Amino acid sequence: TLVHVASVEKGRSYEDFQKVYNAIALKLREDDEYDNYIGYGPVLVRLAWHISGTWDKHDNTGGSYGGTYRFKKEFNDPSNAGLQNGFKFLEPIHKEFPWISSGDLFSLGGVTAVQEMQGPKIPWRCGRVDTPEDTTPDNGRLPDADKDAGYVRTFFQRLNMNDREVVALMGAHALGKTHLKNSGYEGPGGAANNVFTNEFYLNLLNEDWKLEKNDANNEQWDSKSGYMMLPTDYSLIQDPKYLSIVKEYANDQDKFFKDFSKAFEKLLENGITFPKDAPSPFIFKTLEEQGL
Numbered sequence: 306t307l308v309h310v311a312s313v314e315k316g317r318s319y320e321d322f323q324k325v326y327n328a329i330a331l332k333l334r335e336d337d338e339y340d341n342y343i344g345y346g347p348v349l350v351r352l353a354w355h356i357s358g359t360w361d362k363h364d365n366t367g368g369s370y371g372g373t374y375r376f377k378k379e380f381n382d383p384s385n386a387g388l389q390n391g392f393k394f395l396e397p398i399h400k401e402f403p404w405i406s407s408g409d410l411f412s413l414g415g416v417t418a419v420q421e422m423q424g425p426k427i428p429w430r431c432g433r434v435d436t437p438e439d440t441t442p443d444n445g446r447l448p449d450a451d452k453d454a455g456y457v458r459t460f461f462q463r464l465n466m467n468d469r470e471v472v473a474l475m476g477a478h479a480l481g482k483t484h485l486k487n488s489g490y491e492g493p494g495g496a497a498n499n500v501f502t503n504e505f506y507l508n509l510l511n512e513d514w515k516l517e518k519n520d521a522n523n524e525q526w527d528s529k530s531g532y533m534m535l536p537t538d539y540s541l542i543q544d545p546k547y548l549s550i551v552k553e554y555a556n557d558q559d560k561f562f563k564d565f566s567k568a569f570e571k572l573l574e575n576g577i578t579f580p581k582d583a584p585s586p587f588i589f590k591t592l593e594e595q596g597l
């Protein structure tokens with residue numbers, strides 16, 4: 306039973322990681338034309354989730370710790386199609402700060418993106434350590450989109466996530482868009498797709514959804530407003546337990562933000578043992594808070 310102990314990059318402290326945050330945030334501000342003016346925020350969130358979502362609680366394989374997305378087996382996972390854009394965005398940041406581990410950089414990209422998109426503060430811990438190519442998880446550990454609530458619940462239990470955590474994490478589907486060439490799905494989840502809000506839940510409950518087969522022959526739920534939901538998204542209003550939580554978050558964005566922050570930190574930390582004397586989690590200032 307593999308143990309991965311967090312080990313702080315030698316000699317580095319909060320201020321050093323705040324500089325990496327700031328470089329990511331400045332580049333997010335600059336590269337505003339990407340994906341028809343969405344910017345890189347959403348793809349960075351998806352990247353941080355996909356490098357973490359390979360985790361298996363039963364044997365501690367996968368997860369964010371080892372930075373294994375840098376190896377071709379994982380980079381070329383069909384489930385990761387499109388994430389190469391996020392990797393390429395982070396390359397100049399890694400060149401400026403070569404001392405940071407790959408797992409720390411990929412996870413920090415997601416935290417930075419959420420915060421810079423006016424989302425909640427997400428506490429973040431350093432100390433992921435790059436592991437060798439033979440520790441890369443096989444493809445097939447990330448979730449299918451064509452499934453129902455039972456599939457979603459079973460899937461997320463492999464990551465030690467419960468119903469509230471699942472529903473909170475899925476709120477990230479307000480961000481960005483699906484792209485037919487990446488995943489065989491097409492369209493945004495709502496209007497505000499580069500500002501972090503509770504729109505996903507509001508749209509699930511309030512839109513007029515029609516089940517359609519898209520140009521890749523996959524089923525998705527499409528609204529009159531030009532929004533879409535995957536079958537796994539729509540399952541959150543089919544399952545009674547999930548539906549109750551969707552209503553809670555549609556009614557209270559502050560609660561969503563609190564629950565998302567916890568769930569996303571947990572996701573990004575799964576598999577990692579933090580020594581009892583490790584630094585406390587860092588809460589990075591936004592560029593705005595620093596006057597930058």
Ligand code: HEM
Pocket residue numbers: 347348350351354386387448449450451457474475477478480481482483484485487488489490535537569
């Ligand atoms: C059942 C679980 C999930 C399924 C089946 C799923 C599936 C998908 C699919 C098919 C796409 C479109 C990819 C593309 O065409 O570019 C997507 C996008 C996205 N996913 Fe999820 N997802 C899941 C959970 C999550 C979680 C837990 C998060 C983060 C907390 C997340 C964040 C995102 C973001 C931000 C996008 C937009 C990316 C972009 O605009 O480039 N997803 N997801």
Ligand SMILES: OCc1ccncc1
Pocket residue numbers: 478479480481482483492493494495533534535538
């Ligand atoms: O990226 C927007 C989106 C919308 C619905 N499901 C997944 C992703």
